[PDB]
Amino acid sequence: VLARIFKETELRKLKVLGSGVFGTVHKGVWIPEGESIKIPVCIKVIEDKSGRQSFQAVTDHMLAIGSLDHAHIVRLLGLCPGSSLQLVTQYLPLGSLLDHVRQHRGALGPQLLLNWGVQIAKGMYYLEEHGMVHRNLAARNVLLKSPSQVQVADFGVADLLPPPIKWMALESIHFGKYTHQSDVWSYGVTVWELMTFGAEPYAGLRLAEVPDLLEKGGRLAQPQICTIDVYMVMVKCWMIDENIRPTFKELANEFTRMARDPPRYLVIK
Amino acid sequence: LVEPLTPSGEAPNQALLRILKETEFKKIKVLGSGAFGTVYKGLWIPEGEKVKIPVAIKELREATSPKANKEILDEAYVMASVDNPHVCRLLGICLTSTVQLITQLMPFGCLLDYVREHKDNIGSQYLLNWCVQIAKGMNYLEDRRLVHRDLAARNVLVKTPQHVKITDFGLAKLLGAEEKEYHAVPIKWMALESILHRIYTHQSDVWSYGVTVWELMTFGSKPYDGIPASEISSILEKGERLPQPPICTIDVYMIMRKCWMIDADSRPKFRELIIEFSKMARDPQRYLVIQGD
Numbered sequence: 290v291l292a293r294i295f296k297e298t299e300l301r302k303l304k305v306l307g308s309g310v311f312g313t314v315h316k317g318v319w320i321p322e323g324e325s326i327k328i329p330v331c332i333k334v335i336e337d338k339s340g341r342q343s344f345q346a347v348t349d350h351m352l353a354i355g356s357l358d359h360a361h362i363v364r365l366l367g368l369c370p371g372s373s374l375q376l377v378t379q380y381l382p383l384g385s386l387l388d389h390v391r392q393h394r395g396a397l398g399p400q401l402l403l404n405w406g407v408q409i410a411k412g413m414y415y416l417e418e419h420g421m422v423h424r425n426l427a428a429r430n431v432l433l434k435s436p437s438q439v440q441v442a443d444f445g446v447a448d449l450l451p452p453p454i455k456w457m458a459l460e461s462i463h464f465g466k467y468t469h470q471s472d473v474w475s476y477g478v479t480v481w482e483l484m485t486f487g488a489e490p491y492a493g494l495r496l497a498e499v500p501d502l503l504e505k506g507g508r509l510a511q512p513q514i515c516t517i518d519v520y521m522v523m524v525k526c527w528m529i530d531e532n533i534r535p536t537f538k539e540l541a542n543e544f545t546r547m548a549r550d551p552p553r554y555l556v557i558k
Numbered sequence: 559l560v561e562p563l564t565p566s567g568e569a570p571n572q573a574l575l576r577i578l579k580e581t582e583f584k585k586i587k588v589l590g591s592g593a594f595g596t597v598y599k600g601l602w603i604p605e606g607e608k609v610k611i612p613v614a615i616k617e618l619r620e621a622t623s624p625k626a627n628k629e630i631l632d633e634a635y636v637m638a639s640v641d642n643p644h645v646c647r648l649l650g651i652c653l654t655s656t657v658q659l660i661t662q663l664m665p666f667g668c669l670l671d672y673v674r675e676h677k678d679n680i681g682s683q684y685l686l687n688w689c690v691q692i693a694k695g696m697n698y699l700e701d702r703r704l705v706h707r708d709l710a711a712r713n714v715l716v717k718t719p720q721h722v723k724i725t726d727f728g729l730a731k732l733l734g735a736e737e738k739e740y741h742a743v744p745i746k747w748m749a750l751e752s753i754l755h756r757i758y759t760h761q762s763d764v765w766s767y768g769v770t771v772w773e774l775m776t777f778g779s780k781p782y783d784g785i786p787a788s789e790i791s792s793i794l795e796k797g798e799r800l801p802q803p804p805i806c807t808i809d810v811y812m813i814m815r816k817c818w819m820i821d822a823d824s825r826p827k828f829r830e831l832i833i834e835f836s837k838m839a840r841d842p843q844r845y846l847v848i849q850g851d
């Protein structure tokens with residue numbers, strides 16, 4: 290849980306995995322300068338949009354991100370400063386949880402779904418207890434470490450760029466205000482994705498009408514497999530007033546109680 | 559790695575909690591005033607579909623803690639869970655600044671109001687039928703293990719003079735298979751143990767049922783009137799109860815008095831009440847002396 294720094298010659302990008310809202314993720318290799326070994330890693334490239342040119346030096350948000358370590362988050366192996374910031378992590382071949390639940394769907398156990406809820410909650414709780422706000426939590430940003438364990442990824446990235454709509458809270462859309470509460474909102478949307486086996490939030494709508502719907506009292510509909518008990522949680526996550534929303538501790542706990550008896554809270558066959 | 563399981567063979571609650579946007583329903587007028595919030599009469603048009611639906615819209619005053627709107631959300635939970643002809647149903651909620659429950663409108667509204675305004679067209683068989691329907695509703699509530707901690711004439715709505723339903727659920731709590739009692743205010747409707755030890759059971763709602771029937775038989779009189787909320791425990795402890803209503807025979811007042819026994823197990827069951835009042839309802843002028851019929 291200490292931040293390691295790389296030189297630009299130590300890293301080599303082999304293939305583009307894909308791009309998102311912030312940076313571009315490459316499947317690459319790490320070759321320490323002394324050696325000829327190639328170690329498979331994941332190199333995310335973020336372009337410096339500061340204008341002050343300050344990804345040339347390791348900042349303190351960088352050291353903050355480079356610090357964090359937990360059983361259910363994606364740990365940052367290292368970083369490489371310069372024109373473009375390079376975030377180096379482990380290559381998780383199993384891919385994102387989104388694709389996973391989209392591919393296996395109901396074939397996955399309800400126990401697995403609930404437990405994954407618990408794990409994601411634990412990761413976000415860790416991040417919250419160390420002052421880290423995610424600002425981009427989604428089903429795509431939760432990767433599979435093990436077939437039975439998941440880790441939260443892409444945390445802290447948003448605060449590296451100068452000042453995703455379907456996972457953002459209302460205050461975030463309206464005023465660009467980001468807190469752990471907004472992360473709770475996004476968590477709600479993520480679990481919704483999970484329990485619907487990877488559905489698109491607000492599918493029929495366009496990006497323009499999502500905040501409208503939210504301000505009028507509309508939410509994402511109850512998932513077919515979700516008991517009212519599990520949907521109530523997501524509903525309380527999508528509250529307009531921040532201080533009403535659950536804490537990550539409470540979420541982890543209630544999902545733990547639910548995980549202690551899966552068929553009572555999820556109906557799948 | 560994974561959470562260890564220990565299963566309790568109870569059934570999954572698959573109640574559907576539908577959510578509506580504010581623009582789907584209109585507010586016409588006010589039905590109820592209070593500190594809790596406001597109850598509106600209005601129209602709900604589901605978009606797509608043809609119909610416009612008369613509805614009641616209950617809207618809430620913002621949260622105190624993480625707990626204050628827990629209240630309204632548990633209320634919505636309960637109202638979405640129940641399904642019975644004599645307890646009516648949540649149609650959906652609007653999650654805005656202020657949470658809004660949306661139920662089916664009951665044209666004639668409060669039953670207390672009804673027995674107060676129509677004093678001299680209320681015949682034996684309507685009163686007795688009302689008692690039967692309320693008993694049925696409470697029986698359904700008991701058989702799904704939730705206790706209505708606030709049963710009273712105020713909280714019974716009138717769909718039609720023939721047909722009444724039960725509603726509040728603001729204080730209602732769901733007992734586990736585990737539990738038998740609930741440990742926690744309407745003083746003059748609660749059982750003695752509820753005042754002394756804050757204990758609530760299905761047998762407390764029987765006391766509340768007795769007081770309710772007393773309200774109906776007195777055409778909407780106020781229980782223990784002139785006697786403040788403090789004190790009442792003493793009164794009940796001496797053995798004093800509500801007086802015998804003028805229209806009631808010794809048998810009906812027998813049932814009422816039996817509902818107000820100290821020993822909670824001595825009190826009748828809602829089953830028994832359904833049977834008894836249904837039996838009385840087939841010869842109503844025998845058990846109630848009212849001059850209109």
Ligand SMILES: Nc1ncnc2c1ncn2[C@@H]1O[C@H](COP(=O)(O)OP(=O)(O)NP(=O)(O)O)[C@@H](O)[C@H]1O
Pocket residue numbers: 306307308309310311312313314331378379380381382384385425429430432442443453
């Ligand atoms: N550690 C990793 N191992 C394997 N694939 C990864 C890893 N991290 C990211 N990816 C993949 O990188 C691709 C695109 O990266 P990225 O753009 O950061 O994610 P994203 O899906 O667009 N979500 P966003 O944070 O909005 O950008 C996705 O297909 C991910 O599966």
Ligand SMILES: Nc1ncnc2c1ncn2[C@@H]1O[C@H](COP(=O)(O)OP(=O)(O)O)[C@@H](O)[C@H]1O
Pocket residue numbers: 589590592594597613614616661662663664665667668712713715725726728
């Ligand atoms: N669905 C409804 N139809 C007609 N009147 C209603 C309805 N819901 C509430 N009311 C009015 O509100 C009062 C009771 O509502 P209730 O939900 O018990 O309020 P609270 O419990 O918040 O005091 C009654 O006087 C009744 O006239």
Ligand SMILES: [Mg+2]
Pocket residue numbers: 309429430443
């Ligand atoms: Mg990502």
Ligand SMILES: [Mg+2]
Pocket residue numbers: 712713726
């Ligand atoms: Mg009331």
